[PDB]
């Protein structure tokens, strides 16, 4: 009875190295909005805060609080949305806008999140979780592809996805509403960039 999103819903986590259409149903997420370079402290803190909350929720089964509707779950891969506002140059990593996200089971409500922030304040006092929010949404119709290799080469994968959209008659909705979406299967701090695996997912209509 432990949820493992990667196994039970593998299609969302294991595309091949070619573009495919995918419909992404409603999911529940912890999210942190932020700005700037992923090498910077703000992004690192965002990721740390998400994991602090997710593991506080998961490990609640070993404490004295029974969360309503609790199910154990394998913490899923980190994901991110990426967009810009105003005139923008890609080389300008400080201008990047993003949201860092972790999927959660349905039982995670605002009340569960508030409880986890309080527990984490005690157990993990150096992590500020105040910007973590809970967002449920249906990402919907997308194209996705596994990108193997450095982030600087993602343009190759994105271009192939764009060509697939043309071939299939799909409109590219990517922008500031339906956002460019990465799912990180590798830890970029520990992985050889040449062998990193990242899902790139772009919304379509
Ligand atoms: C109690 O039990 C547990 C608690 C636990 N916590 C964690 C955990 O915290 N984890 C795992 C892991 C992912 C993670 C993290 C901590 C982190 O601070 C962190 N940073 C990154 C990171 O930096 N990432 C991921 C994305 C990203 C980077 C990165 O380097 C970049 O290069 C600059 C990036 N460039 C770009 C682009 O260019 S996009 C265009 C994107 C991007 C990843 C993680 C694990 C754990 C296990 C437990 O059992």
Numbering used by the authors: 4 to 208
What do the authors say?
Here, we show an additional level of resistance regarding YTM cyclopropyl hydrolysis catalyzed by a subfamily of GyrI-like proteins exemplified by YtkR7, a gene product coded for within the same biosynthetic gene cluster of 1. We define this subfamily of GyrI-like proteins as cyclopropanoid cyclopropyl hydrolases (CCHs), and demonstrate that they share a conserved aromatic cage for the hydrolysis of 1 and 2, and thereby confer cellular protection. The GyrI-like proteins possess a duplicate βαββ configuration and appear to have been adapted for small-molecule binding. To probe the catalytic mechanism of CCHs, we carried out co-crystallography and molecular dynamics (MD) simulation experiments on lin2189, a CCH protein from Listeria innocua that can hydrolyze both 1 and 2.
Interestingly, this variant lost the enzymatic activity and allowed us to obtain a complex structure of lin2189 E185L and 1 in which the electron density for the substrate is partially visible. Detailed investigation of the electron density map implicated that several residues in the solvent-accessible channel (e.g., E157) potentially interfered with substrate binding. Therefore, we designed a series of variants based on E185L. As expected, we successfully solved the complex structure of a catalytically deficient form lin2189 E157A E185L and 1 with complete density at a resolution of 1.2 Å. The structure is composed of two monomers, each of which binds one molecule of 1 at the crevice. The 1L- and 1M-subunits of 1 are stretched into an aromatic cage consisting of Y46, W85, W99, F154, and Y187, while the 1R-subunit is exposed to the solvent and stabilized by Y54 and Y58 through π–π stacking interactions. However, the reactive methylene group in the cyclopropyl ring was next to the acidic residue E185 (4.5 Å) that is very close to another acidic residue E157 (2.8 Å), providing a likely electrostatic mechanism to explain both our difficulty in crystallizing the native complex and our ability to crystallize the double-mutant form. The importance of the catalytic pocket to hydrolysis activity is further strengthened by the fact that the catalytic residues are very highly conserved among CCHs, and mutagenesis experiments confirmed that the acidic residues E157 and E185 are essential for the catalysis.
